[PDB]
């Protein structure tokens, strides 16, 4: 791909984080803590899952960023509406305002309803995310495999401002403690 020139500097919004998350001082890394992180509750925090939003809001144009997923067993990545549900149980789908992919139990899937099997020969260590607001496109790229396409959501109906979306996943296995990291430009 040739989307790298739309690179944007994403930072994580502490106020939206699940209360177990630990966000680095530079707001560029997030991981699952082993306990509640001693923060107050608020209506923005994702309550049921280890999720957090980027601070940036996008309503036009083309945007690109990269995320490091090295040695994780489970995670979700993509974008979502600013107005997504924060409390209780929900599925990741475009109907619920999410455009995402994930790793779970050794398979990669796109967050359609129902979910779509992805075909990845080279397990990625870094993921590129491209959003074209006007075109209604969200695309995912395998940076480990020379930028190869993973998945494109087209005919997207954003229906609001978009925020970068992250899920570090649970760590029931003891093998998923590693952080998500926003990679430098
Ligand atoms: O219930 C948990 N868990 C963490 C410990 O392991 C069990 C699952 N929480 C609270 C709700 C959302 C979270 F991210 C963390």
From Swiss-Prot:
Induction and repression of expression: Up-regulated by IFN.
Subcellular location: Cytoplasm; Cytoplasmic vesicle, Autophagosome; Nucleus; Cytoplasm, P-body
Entry PTM: Autoubiquitinated; does not lead to its proteasomal degradation. Deubiquitinated by USP4; leading to its stabilization. Autoubiquitinated.
Domain B30.2/SPRY: 8-185
Record text about domains: The coiled-coil is necessary for the cytoplasmic localization. The RING-type zinc finger is necessary for ubiquitination and for the IRF3-driven interferon beta promoter activity. Interacts with SKP2 and CUL1 in a RING finger-independent manner. The RING-type zinc finger is necessary for ubiquitination of NMI.
Description of how the protein assembles with itself and partners: Homotrimer. Component of a SCF(SKP2)-like complex containing CUL1, SKP1, TRIM21 and SKP2. Interacts with CALR, CUL1, FBXW11, HSPA5, IKBKB, IRF3, SKP1 and VCP. Interacts with SKP2; the interaction with SKP2 does not depend on an intact F-box domain. Interacts (via N-terminus and C-terminus) with DCP2 (via N-terminus and C-terminus). Interacts (via C-terminus) with IRF8 (via C-terminus). Interacts with ULK1, BECN1 and with ATG8 family members, including GABARAP, GABARAPL1, GABARAPL2 and MAP1LC3C/LC3C. Interacts with TRIM21 and SQSTM1/sequestosome 1. Interacts with IRF3.
Family under the similarity heading: Belongs to the TRIM/RBCC family.
Protein's job: E3 ubiquitin-protein ligase whose activity is dependent on E2 enzymes, UBE2D1, UBE2D2, UBE2E1 and UBE2E2. Forms a ubiquitin ligase complex in cooperation with the E2 UBE2D2 that is used not only for the ubiquitination of USP4 and IKBKB but also for its self-ubiquitination. Component of cullin-RING-based SCF (SKP1-CUL1-F-box protein) E3 ubiquitin-protein ligase complexes such as SCF(SKP2)-like complexes. A TRIM21-containing SCF(SKP2)-like complex is shown to mediate ubiquitination of CDKN1B ('Thr-187' phosphorylated-form), thereby promoting its degradation by the proteasome.
Name the UniProt record assigns to this protein: E3 ubiquitin-protein ligase TRIM21
